[PDB]
Design a protein that fits this description.
This is part of a larger assembly, with six copies of chain A. Chain A is mostly helical and 98 residues long. Chain A is 82% helix and 3% strand. Chain A has helices at 2-13, 30-97, and one strand spanning 22-24. Chain F: This is TcdA1.
């Protein structure tokens, strides 16, 4: 949209605008100015776009680190149950000592 | 299915990793030997046929590809047979 | 001490360090040549168009939804339409002789402050009357400002670098105290840099030279640009427009010399007369625009803008389309959205014919050795009653079936023979010589109906028919725009489906991949369609070529034989089905495991019967000494091709997964 | 930037187009200095992404000057898309 | 590309643009403006890099 | 070998792959038609101004 807008203004600017005894007044540089504006805008839009991609990759890396954490917590939970099974035996052997 | 749509490029395939396949290491040995056998003239002492005569008679077989013998036994076999021949 | 220098110069030892020194690299190269589908990744590809690079990075994000991907596609389509509607202005031929070299085109988009795109084509790759698809290059945007008078822009090659001359015109005022107006003209030269940017245009004062040309009002002066062989000078000549080459023979040629440092000098009249009497055939008359050659000390290439809108280049019988009116007809299809863009009845939108001519269908007789010989090649030759040499128009191999070949046959502007206007004859190994009447002769009347001359003998054509009712032909996936059409119809759906897979949006990935191919079939207007594949060059290419392309790029080799693209799509369907089954299998509740099973069974019957492969065969444990000679008769001479190890792997993983579903294990196989 | 809100949409080939008449003011020498106008019909169209293409100028000064308009009167502009032939009919 | 574009516009701007009884109209500062635009753009591109 | 082409053209088999092949999707579609209030989320809506 900005590229079309700048090209349209550039093309509409080359027609002369003062008349009668003085003529011309058309700024000859308008096409180079429009190519400069659109080509310097391009850099900003590529920075915005690259920042959207880098934000997305950040959220993805964070989610994978939550898999590492969730799996660690589940494994610790799982080993505690077997610890309880061993202690249930150890207690049966203490009742039997009684 | 797959076959009745995408068969036909070749009349007889072979299994992955067998000796007879054109990507097997036997095919690489043959292709490499074809180009290598000529880098020196026959009379030169560095000629491959003179330097390693048994390699030129090597059999290409599943046997020579599957059986993982020890290398040092093969170096002994090669030096020994050269001495008994000389 | 001393290797044989002849042996080292072989290609095998030039490729040594890159591929052949390590066994793994050699095996990988050999499979990448023989099995492209394994290494084809839709995300990245050599020669990717700039709008497909806009597309990929636009769609690459964490969340993909139907609306986001739809909008990304509509922006891609906007870019494609903008680059397809542009028209060619002018061209230059890089070489003194038309047989070889390059041709550079300049094209203007339909916008007020126009944007100018330059495109290059290669004549060396052109053969058999058809330009190879890879010979053409994509359009490149020109960054510098261009504001020509009456689209007087003309490229030129100097010192193997591209230069642009264009004439700008400006308007200035004169006092006569009454106030009056007049113009002034400034020739400007620019050139490209190594990084594809454009240097700043350098002004050259031409007011004297143009004022010497008594131009008509609002008439563009004839500008001739040509690069001199040997001397590094740009010849720039201005000539008055004339309707005939016979008039240029004495035209008052203005011009100036331009040197490598962009100094200039005027022409002496005596030099200009010589440059004129040599170059005058290259001057663009008021009727027709010609292409310039490099200066020299059998007509030129030519650009015609037909009234129906086809632009076509000409230099012999040969005519070539340049622009495509596809994008201007697409708008009706686009009003109902993505499902209609990609459909098969979009790909059969008609292209206007190019030039004056007719369509004829030729039916090739079967293979018949007594009328054929051993070599299966055949060639169709055209001849025109200018009685030049013939020109080849088609080349193929005789099948046992018939072949139906529909050709546009050019007809000259002028009927230089009254009895017939073209001759076509059929040549093949058994009877390569031509016979005076031994082919269809065609003649046209005043109302423009083409008929076969009864005097001609059709015995070795199975049939010839003239399609006098047809004035158009299908959209061309081998013409100039072949790259953009493959870019849209096939690559874009596959790239989108691939991106949607990684985001686990399986429902949207299924439809996107279903555009290119669907086993269930296609339904249109409430009726089931016969075709299975939605892309025309995949539908038409039904079996591999007798030989592949030898090229270490998987995509050019798959482009040469699009039967490979079918396997790549098939394999991406299996990837989707397996991933969907694994995702359902990750939930261990009873109901979901039955969904996992029906997903795997769905992929199972698609793959079909696992091939049986007889464990031992004719291969005989030969001596290495023997295999070296058997292979060096100038490896398939002695070693057999293996089945694709990846396809084998799909059967291994599917059978093992169903084995776990039947035995109540989990996916890691733990009870 | 139309004259007297003389803008009229039209559909061509199932795509939306806009015609509007712009008007501009220019000067004439008669050495007394005098004024007069000129009129430029402009056409634009929408793209698939909903952006608008750059307006393309069409010179209408002859055709309007043939219409003996009243002062500060907008010429009757009629725009219609032709069935079959892909032409825009523009009539004043 | 932007440096070439700004230099080209600056050079094309110094020619006069009104004629007849009034002359000139060439903005004398255009070369300094172009050097300013390219030299302030440079800072942004070094930050991106 | 050969399904009846008339039966396949019914809407039920055009919607097959999207909704009706899996029981959960079919139930969800049928409730989303019959009980809109469950799936109405004020945050996002089609045709949002």
């Amino acid at each position: 949209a900005v590229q079309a807008s700048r090209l349209a203004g550039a093309a509409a600017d080359l027609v002369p605008n003062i008349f009668g005894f003085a003529g011309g007044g058309s700024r000859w540089g308008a096409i180079a100015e429009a190519t400069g504006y659109v080509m310097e805008f391009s850099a900003n839009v590529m920075n915005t776009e690259a920042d959207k991609i880098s934000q997305s990759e950040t959220y993805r890396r964070r989610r994978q680190e939550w898999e590492i954490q969730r799996n660690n917590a589940e494994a610790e939970l799982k080993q505690i149950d077997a610890q309880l099974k061993s202690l249930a035996v150890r207690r049966e052997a203490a009742v039997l000592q009684k | 299915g797959y076959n009745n749509q995408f068969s036909g490029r070749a009349s007889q395939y072979v299994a992955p990793g067998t000796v007879s396949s054109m990507f097997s290491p036997a095919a690489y040995l043959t292709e490499l030997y074809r180009e290598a056998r000529n880098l020196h003239a026959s009379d030169s002492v560095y000629y491959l046929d003179t330097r390693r005569p048994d390699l030129k008679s090597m059999a290409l077989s599943q046997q020579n590809m599957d059986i993982e013998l020890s290398t040092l036994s093969l170096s002994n076999e090669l030096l020994l047979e050269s001495i008994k021949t000389e | 001490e001393n290797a044989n220098s002849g042996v080292i110069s072989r290609q095998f030892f030039i490729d040594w360090d890159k591929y052949n020194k390590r066994y793994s690299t050699w095996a990988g190269v050999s499979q990448l040549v023989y099995y492209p589908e394994n290494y084809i990744d839709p995300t990245m590809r050599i020669g990717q168009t700039k709008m497909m690079d806009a597309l990929l990075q636009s769609v690459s994000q964490s969340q993909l939804n139907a609306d986001t991907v739809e909008d990304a596609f509509m922006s891609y389509l906007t870019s494609f339409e903008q680059v397809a509607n542009l028209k060619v202005i002018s061209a230059y031929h890089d070489n003194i002789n038309n047989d070889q070299g390059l041709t550079y085109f300049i094209g203007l988009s339909e916008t007020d402050a126009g944007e100018y795109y330059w495109r290059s084509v290669d004549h060396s790759k052109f053969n058999d009357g058809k330009f190879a698809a890879n010979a053409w290059s994509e359009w490149h945007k020109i960054d510098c400002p261009i504001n020509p008078y009456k689209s007087t822009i003309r490229p030129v090659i100097y010192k193997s670098r591209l230069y642009l001359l264009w004439l700008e015109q400006k308007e200035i005022t004169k006092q006569t105290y009454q106030t009056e107006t007049d113009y002034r003209y400034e020739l400007k030269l620019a050139h490209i840099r190594y990084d594809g940017t454009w240097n700043t245009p350098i002004t050259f004062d031409v007011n004297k030279k143009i004022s010497e040309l008594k131009l008509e009002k609002n008439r563009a002066p004839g500008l001739y640009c040509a690069g001199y062989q040997g001397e590094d000078t740009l010849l720039v000549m201005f000539y008055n427009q004339q309707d005939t080459l016979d008039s240029y023979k004495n035209a008052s040629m203005q011009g100036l010399y331009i040197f490598a440092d962009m100094a200039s000098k005027d022409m002496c009249p005596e030099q200009s007369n010589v440059y004129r009497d040599n170059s005058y055939q290259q001057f663009d008359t008021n009727n027709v625009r010609r292409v310039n050659n490099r200066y020299a000390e059998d007509n030129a290439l030519t650009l015609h803008h037909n009234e129906n809108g086809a632009q076509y280049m000409q230099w012999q019988s040969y005519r070539t389309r340049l622009n495509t009116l596809f994008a201007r007809q697409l708008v009706a299809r686009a009003t109902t959205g993505i499902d209609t863009i990609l459909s098969m009845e979009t790909q059969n939108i008609q292209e206007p014919q190019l030039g004056k001519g007719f369509y004829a269908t030729f039916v090739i007789p079967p293979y018949n050795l007594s009328t054929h010989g051993d070599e299966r090649w055949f060639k169709l030759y055209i001849k025109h009653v200018v009685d030049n040499n013939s020109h080849i128009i088609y080349s193929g191999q005789l099948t046992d079936t018939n072949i139906n070949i529909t050709l546009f046959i050019p007809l000259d502007d002028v009927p230089l023979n009254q009895d017939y206007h073209a001759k076509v004859y059929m040549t093949f190994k058994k009877s390569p010589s031509d016979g005076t009447w031994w082919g269809p002769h065609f003649v046209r009347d005043d109302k423009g109906i083409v008929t076969i001359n009864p005097k001609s003998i059709l015995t070795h054509f199975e049939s010839v028919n003239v399609l006098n009712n047809i004035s158009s032909e299908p959209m061309d996936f081998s013409g100039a725009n072949s790259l953009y059409f493959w870019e849209l119809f096939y690559y874009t759906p596959m790239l989108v489906a691939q991106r949607l897979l990684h985001e686990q949006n399986f429902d949207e990935a299924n439809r996107w991949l279903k555009y290119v191919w669907s086993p269930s079939g296609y339904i249109v207007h409430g009726q089931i369609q016969n075709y299975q594949w939605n892309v025309r060059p995949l539908l038409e290419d039904t079996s591999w070529n007798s030989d592949p392309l030898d090229s270490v790029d998987p995509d050019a080799v798959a482009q040469h034989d699009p039967m490979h693209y079918k396997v790549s799509t098939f394999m991406r369907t299996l990837d989707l089905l397996i991933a969907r089954g694994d995702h359902a299998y990750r939930q261990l509740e009873r109901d979901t495991l039955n969904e996992a099973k029906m997903w795997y069974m769905q992929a199972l019957h698609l793959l079909g019967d696992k091939p049986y492969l007889p464990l031992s065969t004719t291969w005989s444990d030969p001596r290495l000494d023997r295999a070296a000679d058997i292979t060096t008769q100038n490896l398939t001479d002695l070693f057999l091709p293996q089945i694709n190890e990846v396809m084998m792997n799909y059967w291994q993983t599917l059978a093992q997964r169903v084995y776990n579903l039947r035995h109540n294990l989990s996916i890691d196989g733990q009870p």
